[PDB]
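Closing statement on the ANP sub-project.
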Amino acid sequence: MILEEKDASDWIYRGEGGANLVLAYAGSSPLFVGKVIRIQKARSVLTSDEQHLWRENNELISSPNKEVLEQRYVQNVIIPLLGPKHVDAGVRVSVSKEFLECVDKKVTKQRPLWRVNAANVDTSHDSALILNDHSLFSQGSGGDCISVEIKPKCGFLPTSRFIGKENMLKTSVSRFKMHQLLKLEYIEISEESEYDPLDLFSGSKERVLEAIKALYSTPQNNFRVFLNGSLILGGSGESTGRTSPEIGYAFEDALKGFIQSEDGHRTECFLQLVSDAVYGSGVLDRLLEIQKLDKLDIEGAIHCYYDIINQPCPICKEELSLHALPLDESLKIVKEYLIAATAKDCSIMISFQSRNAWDSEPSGDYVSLKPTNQTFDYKVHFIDLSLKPLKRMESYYKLDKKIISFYNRKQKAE
Ligand SMILES: O=P(O)(O)O[C@@H]1[C@@H](OP(=O)(O)O)[C@H](OP(=O)(O)O)[C@H](O)[C@H](OP(=O)(O)O)[C@H]1OP(=O)(O)O
Ligand SMILES: Nc1ncnc2c1ncn2[C@@H]1O[C@H](COP(=O)(O)OP(=O)(O)NP(=O)(O)O)[C@@H](O)[C@H]1O
Ligand SMILES: [Mg+2]
Ligand SMILES: [Zn+2]
């Protein structure tokens, strides 16, 4: 029930995002075998404005800590929306300060330096999240498991009435593609990614495959691959650089026996396998619907935000429409905007294993690889379904203004 100091040595770095540190269990305890632990970082549990926003979900507003908050957020808001088939809310577990402290230290050296600069484990939370490890095909075997993680980002184009005259490029150019230019400018990446989210979410099989090949070539922080829980393609707690021949070889070699093709051809077969799973599964259509809860764009939603927090709108100057909405409706719009923001920033994990004829109940989800003559069963889970803080509406607006006005400036340079 409680993780103490010495338990710390049975957990090993798995990765991290901007919000949580994730460790995988390497011990023997039947309690943790096949799990990861997800620990919130530090960069009362809900502002007053937030309790207003989440009023409809009381069990949410009365969450005693942040861990229970996320847990109930996923169970009560996200589940109802994506079904429970592809989602795990997690089980909370007591951790002690010294355990947390001990984990922080143990993994420090395996973290990107910049991640360590930005934040650490909040060693004041008394709880943490335990999740099923989706790099493991099933909880509690059918041989090896190749697991693929995709952070798809936003797969549609805003079409809002509320997009400003100087910003209409947002109407035709993906946010992900415009953001890439800024990141390069800010030395957050070394080269622009080849991935286009519009391809991946297109519903076109050839365009999904194109997205997958692109993710493979330039994974940044959008693509990872695991062999039985150990990373073989992608970044460790951060964006990785373009796939090089050295990385190409290492990954090709890691696939041996799993993709049963000739040496050198495994990679192409694996890419097709992922594509077939994504596409055939239809899992992205559902995610995309949630993303489209951002109905009005940040340029529209921001106006409702100031109404919700009762501040005169600094964006309007000396939109009669949005400002004439009843409070109830402004709340809805912003809540949906923040649900959409969860959807836009989560990941999909797709676990693969050789079709097991001895399954006592044969799986309905699988993929037959043309060439190899193999069948793989697969499973999809969504991960990283974090609650986004309402206050963040302000920076969403500024980051957006920054993205588009830099993209415009870059284009003007014809
Ligand atoms: O705003 P975006 O689209 O850049 O997304 C942020 C991510 O950057 P990305 O562009 O995905 O590399 C960002 O990822 P990195 O920290 O850059 O790996 C986080 O996921 C961030 O969420 P949070 O602060 O952890 O709640 C994300 O912020 P939210 O927009 O989800 O609040
Ligand atoms: N249930 C899980 N099973 C397997 N791997 C996981 C699981 N949850 C997280 N991970 C891995 O650990 C990494 C960090 O988890 P994540 O929940 O995305 O952290 P985060 O800081 O909340 N991400 P973000 O806020 O979107 O930047 C993920 O990219 C996965 O590789
Ligand atoms: Mg998160
Ligand atoms: Zn306004």
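The domain at 1-143 is CATH 3.30.200.110 (Phosphorylase Kinase; domain 1). With this model delivered, the sub-project is considered complete and its resources will be redirected to Aim 3.
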